[PDB]
Amino acid sequence: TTFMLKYDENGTITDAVDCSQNPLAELKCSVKSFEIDKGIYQTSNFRVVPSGDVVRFPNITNLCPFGEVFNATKFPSVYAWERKKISNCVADYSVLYNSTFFSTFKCYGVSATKLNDLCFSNVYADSFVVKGDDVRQIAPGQTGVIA
Amino acid sequence: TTFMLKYDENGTITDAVDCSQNPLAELKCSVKSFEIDKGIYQTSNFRVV
Amino acid sequence: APATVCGPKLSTDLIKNQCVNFNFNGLTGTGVLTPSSKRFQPFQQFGRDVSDFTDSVRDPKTSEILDISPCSFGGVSVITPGTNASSEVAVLYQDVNCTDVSTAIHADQLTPAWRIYSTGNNVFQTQAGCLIGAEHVDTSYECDIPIGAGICASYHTKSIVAYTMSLGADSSIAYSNNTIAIPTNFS
Amino acid sequence: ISITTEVMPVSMAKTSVDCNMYICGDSTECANLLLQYGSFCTQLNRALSGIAAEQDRNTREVFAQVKQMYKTPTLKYFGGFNFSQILPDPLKPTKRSFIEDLLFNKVTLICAQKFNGLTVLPPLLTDDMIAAYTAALVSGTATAGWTFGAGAALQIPFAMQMAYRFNGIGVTQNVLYENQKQIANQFNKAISQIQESLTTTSTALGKLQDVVNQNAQALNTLVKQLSSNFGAISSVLNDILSRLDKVEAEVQIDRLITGRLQSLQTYVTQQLIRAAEIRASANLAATKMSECVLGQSKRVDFCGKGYHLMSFPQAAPHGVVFL
Amino acid sequence: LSSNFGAISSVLNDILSRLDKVEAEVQIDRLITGRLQSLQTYVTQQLIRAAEIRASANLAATKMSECVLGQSKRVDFCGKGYHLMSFPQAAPHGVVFLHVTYVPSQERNFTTAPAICHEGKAYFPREGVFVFNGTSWFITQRNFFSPQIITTDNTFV
Amino acid sequence: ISITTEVMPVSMAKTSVDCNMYICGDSTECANLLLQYGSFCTQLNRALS
Ligand SMILES: *[C@@H]1O[C@H](CO)[C@@H](O)[C@H](O)[C@H]1NC(C)=O
Ligand SMILES: *[C@@H]1O[C@H](CO)[C@@H](O)[C@H](O)[C@H]1NC(C)=O
Ligand SMILES: *[C@@H]1O[C@H](CO)[C@@H](O)[C@H](O)[C@H]1NC(C)=O
Ligand SMILES: *[C@@H]1O[C@H](CO)[C@@H](O)[C@H](O)[C@H]1NC(C)=O
Ligand SMILES: *[C@@H]1O[C@H](CO)[C@@H](O)[C@H](O)[C@H]1NC(C)=O
Ligand SMILES: *[C@@H]1O[C@H](CO)[C@@H](O)[C@H](O)[C@H]1NC(C)=O
Ligand SMILES: *[C@@H]1O[C@H](CO)[C@@H](O)[C@H](O)[C@H]1NC(C)=O
Ligand SMILES: *[C@@H]1O[C@H](CO)[C@@H](O)[C@H](O)[C@H]1NC(C)=O
Ligand SMILES: *[C@@H]1O[C@H](CO)[C@@H](O)[C@H](O)[C@H]1NC(C)=O
C-alpha cells in the first residue's frame, strides 16, 4: 500500500496516513498535507478487469504442421529454396524452441516465449542449406555478401 | 503515391483523392477535407537534384 | 487475415459484461465487448475508428460483429469541506456512467480501491460525472464548490449537499413609463 | 443608429487527458515503466486541470457582473424599441433568445469514453445558465441600466434611459424625443439586419469557430501521435507487449513512452498558451460587459464603431456576442 | 531529481561510483535528458506564468494610474459602485487597492416625465430627470435626490 | 504643452522554419527516419505559421 509519513523536528514519525483507506486519505497523499482547505482535487485510477476472453479462431484444429518441415530430408539449394504454406493448422511452438536443435535461433519482431500466444494468418517456411558464415548473413541488411 | 480515402456510414469508400494530382488535391490531403473554405495553406517540399 | 496458427489455448465464451480481458487472434487488449451494427465486408475483420486503437472486431468463431469500448475509466475527484471544520466523508467523482460504477463498487472492479468504503447511498448521473457521497437537495443556494454542468457542492444540513446552483438571488423590478427611482442616500 | 456584433471568445474546452490511459492504458507493465518518470503524469494532469479550473473563472468573470437575476419583463415593446433578444417564454421551448438561438446554430447525455484517454469536461455554467445571465443583463439594460452596474438596480423608463445616453455623447436630450419614432425604427431595423446578417454570412462564427477548430485540431494532433511509431516496432502498444517478452520490450516501450510524453508535454504547453490567449480575451470581454453593457463608454472605438449608446450581451457558445 | 528516468538510480553520484564511465555514458544520458526535459518543462511553465502576471501587473499598472492618481469614469474597473478614489497598499508580490466607492443605497419611487409643457414649446432638462414629489415638479441629478426649483437655466428649448 | 514618445511594439518576425530542412535536409534516409515521429513536422510548421 502507498503510505504517507509525517516526521518531526526530532525526526520521529508522529503521524501516518494510508493512501487507500478512504478518499479523504487519498487526497492527503495527493496534495501532500494533513489539513486541507476546501474544494475539489484529483486522482486518476479506474476499472480493474474481472474476466477474460481468449476466444481465438481454429474451428478445424489440426496439429504440428512443421513436424514434417524441419525433419524433412530433401532440402533444396540456396537459389531454389522452397516456400511451404501452412494451412489451418495449430502450430504449437516450443517443440521447436526449447530443445536446442539449432545452432542459431534468432527471432525478429516476435519473441519465442510469446510466439505461442498470438495467432498468425499464414506462416511460411523457407528451407535451404548455407555456410556457417552465411548463418549470420541470413538477416535484414547484410547486403554485400553472396548468400 | 500518398492517397486519401473517404469512408461511409456503411463503411464503403465513396470518394478518393490523389495527393500528387494537382495542388488543390495536395491541399485536400493537407487539411484532411474535401470542401475547403478559402485562404492560403501549406506543404513544405522542394528541389530534387 | 482469418488465422492459421493458434499456439493453443482453450477458447472461452464471449460475454457482453463490461471489462473483459479479450484475447482475440492478435488483440491482447481489454475492454467491453458489445454487439454492434457495423457492416464488415468479408475480407476485413478488424475495425478502427479514428486512430491506432481497434474499435470493433468480427468474432473468429461465430462471425458476430461487435464493437469494443474500453474499461470505463476517468478521473476521481473528491469534494472536501474544511478538514479542521469536518473530517466527515469526502464525497467523490466518477466521470463515468453511474450504473457502471455502482455495479463495480459492490464488487471489486475499481482500482483506486478504497478499503473502508461501504458508501455509497447516493447516486447521480450529472454530466460532470456521478457523485457518490453527496446528497441531492432540491433547494438551491449559491455555488460553493464547483462541480460541472450547473451543480455545485457544499456543506449544509452537517452533510455534503449537492444541488443545482441558484445564480445569486432572483429579483424583480417593475418597468413603468412614468416612475423613475432615484436614490435619497448613499453608503 | 446602427448596432454591430462584436464577438469575444471567453472560454474553451475543458479537456483533461487521463495521462496514464493515453500513454499506455491497457498495459500494466508500461504503467510500471511509466512510474519512473516521477511526476510527468499527475503534474501534466494537474497542469490542464488548472486550465479547466479557470475556464469557469473566465465565464464567471464575464457573465456574473450582475448579482441579482432580473426576470424577463413581459411588455417588451419598450417605447418603440422591439427587443427580440430577451428570451420569450411561449414560442421558444428552450430558454434562450432568438438571436442567441441563431448564434448557437452557427458553430461546429451518457458517457462515451474512447480508448485514447481524452475527454471534454462540461462547463460549470451550462448554456441555459449562460442564456439566463444574458437575459438578466438585457432586462437590466432595458429597465434599469445605470445603478444596475454600480449597486442595486433602479427602474428608469427606456426612453428616459436612452436620452441620458445621448446626453453622454453630448447630443442633447432634445434630440431623442424630437426623433424618438425615427430613433426606434432605426433601432428595430438594426436588429432585423443582425437577424439577417449573422444567419448566412458566418462572421460571429469566425472568431468563435477559430477557437473551436484550434482546440479540435490540437486534439486530433494528440490522438494521431498514438499512431506514431517513435522508432518502436509498432505504434500499437499491446503488440509490443504480446511479442517481445518484457526484456526486449523495455527498450521498445521506452521509445514509445518518451514519444508520448513529448506529445502530451507538447499538447499541454500548447493549451496553456491558448488559455492565456483566451483569458486575455475573457478579461477583455469581462470589461466590455462591465463598461459597454452596464455603463456607457466614453472610451472611443472600444465598444462600437460610432459614439456608443449601449450594448447587449448574447449567449454565444464559448463566447459573447455584444450588440 | 529523485526521478529515475530509466537509469539504475536517481542519485547521480551512485551512477558514477559503480559503472566505470563506459556503461555510465548510457545511464547518465538517460538521466540527463530526463533532467533537461524537467528544466525545459519548468522554464516553459514559468514563462507562461510570467505572461499571466505581466498581464496582471499591466492591469495593476493602469489601476494605480487611473484609480489612484485620477478618478475613473470607467465603470466596474476600480470599484463596484461609482468610484471616488483608491489607495494602493504594499502587499507581498502584489497590490491591494482600497477602492473608495459611492454605492447609492436608499431610493424612493418618483413619477417623472420628460419635457414639461410650459407656454407652447416644452422644456427638456439641462441634465435632469424632472422628478415629481407630492404636487410639485423639480429637477434632480439621477444619482442623489436633490430637488431644485425649476428655472430657465435648468432647462433649454 | 510637451509631447512624449511612447513606443509600442506591434509585430515581430514572421519566421517559418522549414522543419525537414532544419533537422536533416540534404539526407533522405533521415527524412524517412523522421517520418515515424508522426506530426512533429507539419504541426511544428503549422504552429509558427
Ligand atoms: C524533541 O523536540 C521537542 C520540540 O518539539 C523538544 O521539546 C524535545 O526536548 C526533543 N526531544 C529530544 C529527545 O530531542
Ligand atoms: C465453427 O463455425 C461455425 C460457423 O462458421 C459455428 O457455427 C460453429 O459453432 C463453429 N464450431 C465451434 C466448435 O464453435
Ligand atoms: C525432429 O525429430 C526429433 C526426434 O529425433 C524431435 O525431437 C524434434 O522435435 C523434431 N523436430 C521438429 C518437430 O521440428
Ligand atoms: C519444452 O517444450 C515442450 C513442447 O512439447 C513442452 O513440454 C514445454 O513447453 C517445455 N518443456 C518443459 C519441461 O519445460
Ligand atoms: C448504407 O447506408 C445508407 C445510409 O447512408 C442506407 O440507406 C443503406 O440501406 C445502407 N446499406 C447497407 C447495405 O447497409
Ligand atoms: C406608457 O406611457 C403612457 C404615457 O402616455 C401611459 O399612458 C401608459 O399607461 C404607459 N403604460 C402602458 C402599458 O402603455
Ligand atoms: C443615510 O443613512 C444613514 C445611515 O446609514 C443616516 O444616518 C442618514 O441620516 C441617511 N441620510 C442621509 C441624507 O445621509
Ligand atoms: C417586432 O415588433 C413586434 C410588435 O411590437 C413584436 O411583437 C416583435 O418583437 C417583433 N416582430 C416579430 C415578427 O418578431
Ligand atoms: C415602487 O413601486 C413599485 C410598483 O408600484 C413597487 O414594486 C416598489 O416596491 C416601489 N418602491 C421602490 C423603492 O421601487
Residue numbers in the entry:
A (entry chain A): 260 to 406
B (entry chain B): 260 to 308
C (entry chain A): 506 to 662, 672 to 701
D (entry chain B): 702 to 809, 831 to 1045
E (entry chain A): 948 to 1104
F (entry chain C): 702 to 750
What does the publication say?
The key determinant of host specificity is the envelope-located trimeric spike (S) glycoprotein, which can be further cleaved by host proteases into an N-terminal S1 subunit and a membrane-bound C-terminal S2 region. In the S1 subunit, the receptor binding domain (RBD, also called the C terminal domain, CTD) is localized in the C-terminal region, spanning ∼200 amino acids, and structural studies have revealed that the RBD consists of two subdomains: the core and external subdomains. For both MERS-CoV and SARS-CoV S proteins, the S2 subunit is mainly composed of α-helices and forms the stem region of the S protein. Here we present high-resolution structures of the trimeric MERS-CoV and SARS-CoV S proteins in its pre-fusion conformation by single particle cryo-electron microscopy (cryo-EM).
By contrast, the SARS-CoV S protein remains uncleaved after thrombin cleavage, and binds its receptor Angiotensin I Converting Enzyme 2(ACE2), confirmed by gel filtration survive assay. For SARS-CoV S trimer, the structures of the two conformations with none or one of the three S1 RBDs in the ‘standing' state were determined to resolutions of 3.2 Å (three-fold symmetry) and 3.7 Å (no symmetry), respectively. An atomic model of the uncleaved SARS-CoV S trimer was built de novo using the 3.2 Å map, except the flexible RBD and part of the S1 NTD which were from fitted crystal structures. The final model includes residues 18–1,104, with several breaks due to the poor densities. The SARS-CoV S trimer can be classified into two classes with all three RBDs in the lying state (56% of particles) or two lying RBDs and one standing RBD (44% of particles). By contrast, the SARS-CoV S ectodomain has a smaller membrane distal head with dimensions of 135 × 120 Å. The structural alignment of the SARS-CoV, MERS-CoV and NL63 CTD-receptor complexes with the S ectodomain structures reveals that the receptor binding surface of the CTD is buried in the S protein trimer (lying state) and is therefore incapable of making equivalent interactions without some initial breathing and transient conformational changes. In the cryo-EM reconstruction, we observed the density for 10 N-linked glycans in MERS-CoV S protein and 14 N-linked glycans in SARS-CoV S protein.
